[PDB]
Design a protein around this nucleic acid. Structure first.
Lengths: 177, 174
DNA sequence: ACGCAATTGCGT
DNA sequence: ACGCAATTGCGT
DNA sequence: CGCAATTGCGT
DNA sequence: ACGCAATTGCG
C-alpha cells in the first residue's frame, strides 16, 4: 500500500468518497459501503502457518453498482465514475450489468444514481437522466455526455473538507423535502 | 469441491433463492463478495490478466444485503451442523457493530442460520441479546432449543428455497 | 483493469 | 480539409 | 478462510 | 471419564 503517487482529477482515491462514507458513518448519518471487487479465487497457498496467499485468481465483471447502503431507512445505490477528458464524460466506462441493475434497483423504489467526477467538478446525475443518455447510446449515437449537457442534466455537489464529498445533502435536498 | 461438508453449505441454497427473487422482480439481494487486497497481476495479451498473488482481508459489513420494497434489507448467513447448539463463534464483533448501526437507521436486519436441519430467520435484537449475555463472559452459544422461539423457522420451499422474503413481508409493513 | 497514446470522423 | 473533440485499443 | 484435533466444563 | 462445549492448527 506504499503508493507515492499519482494524481487523478479525481477519485481520489478510495480517499475521496470513502472517507466521505466513514464520516457519514461515525456521525450516524448513513451506512454506505463500497461493495468489494469480485475475484474468482482459483488457487490458494498457506505458507508458514498463517496466512494464505492466492497464487492464481482472475477478475470477474461485477453485476451490482459500485456503492450501496442505508440512509433514513431507504436504500442507496450508486456508481461513481471519473474522467480526465476535458470535453465530455465517456459513457463507455459504464458497462452492461451495472445499468441493468440500477434499473432493477429503481424497480422497487430506491435512491439509485451516479456520482461523476469530471471537469474539475463532482456532479450528481440522477439515474433517470443517465438512462436517457444510455439509450441515446443504445439506439445509436453519442457514446459520451458532453459537459454542456452534463451540467445541464446533473446536480453539482460541494466538495469540502469533512465530508470531502457531500452527496447526502443532495439526496436530502431532493428525496426528503 | 464447492461444498466440502455433509450438509449442503447454504451458500448456493441462499444465493439461488436470491436469483429467483431477482428474475421475478420480487426484490434485489446480492451477497457482497469476499474482500481481497490484490498484490500482483500478470497480464498476458491473450490470457485474461491473472492476479498471481493476493491476500484476504476481512470486511466488517455483514455480508448480504439489498432492496425490498423501498426498504434496505440486510442479513448474515452462517450455518452450523452440530446438533449440540449453535456457536456465536461464527459472527464477529465488527459484523454485530455494523448491523447495530443498521437497525440504528430503520434498516431491516435478519440473521439467517440453517442449524438443526431447519432454517432459522433470527431477528436482530435477539441476536444482540445472545451476543450480550455472551459478552458478559456468559453462554458463548445459543443452545439448540433456546433459539427455537427466539427465531422463526423460514419456510424452506422449492421455487425459492429458504423463502425469507415473506417473513420480512409479514412483519413489515402489515 | 484501467489510463492514455492512437486513431477516427464530425463539424464548419 | 483539417482541427480537435470522440472513440478505440494496446500496454504495463 | 474449514473440518480434524485439543482440551476443558461439567451429568 | 463421556456428551457437549469451548479453543490451536494449519488443508
Amino acid at each position: 500500500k506504499r503508493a507515492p503517487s499519482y494524481s487523478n482529477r479525481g477519485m481520489t482515491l478510495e480517499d475521496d468518497l470513502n472517507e466521505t462514507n466513514k464520516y457519514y458513518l461515525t456521525n450516524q448519518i448513513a451506512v454506505i459501503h463500497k461493495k468489494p471487487t469480485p475475484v474468482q479465487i482459483v488457487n490458494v497457498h498457506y505458507p508458514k502457518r498463517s496466512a494464505a496467499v492466492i497464487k492464481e485468481a482472475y477478475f470477474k465483471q461485477s453485476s451490482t453498482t459500485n456503492y450501496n447502503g442505508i440512509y433514513k431507512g431507504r436504500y442507496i445505490d450508486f456508481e461513481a465514475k471519473e474522467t480526465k477528458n476535458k470535453t465530455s464524460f465517456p459513457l463507455q466506462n459504464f458497462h452492461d450489468h451495472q445499468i441493468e441493475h440500477m434499473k432493477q434497483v429503481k424497480a422497487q423504489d430506491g435512491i439509485c444514481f451516479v456520482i461523476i467526477s469530471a471537469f474539475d467538478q463532482v456532479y450528481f446525475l440522477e439515474a433517470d437522466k443517465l438512462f436517457y443518455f444510455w439509450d441515446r447510446k443504445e439506439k445509436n449515437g453519442r457514446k459520451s455526455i458532453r459537459k454542456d449537457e452534463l451540467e445541464e442534466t446533473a446536480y453539482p455537489i460541494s466538495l469540502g473538507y469533512a465530508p470531502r464529498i457531500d452527496y447526502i445533502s443532495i439526496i436530502e435536498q431532493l428525496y426528503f423535502s
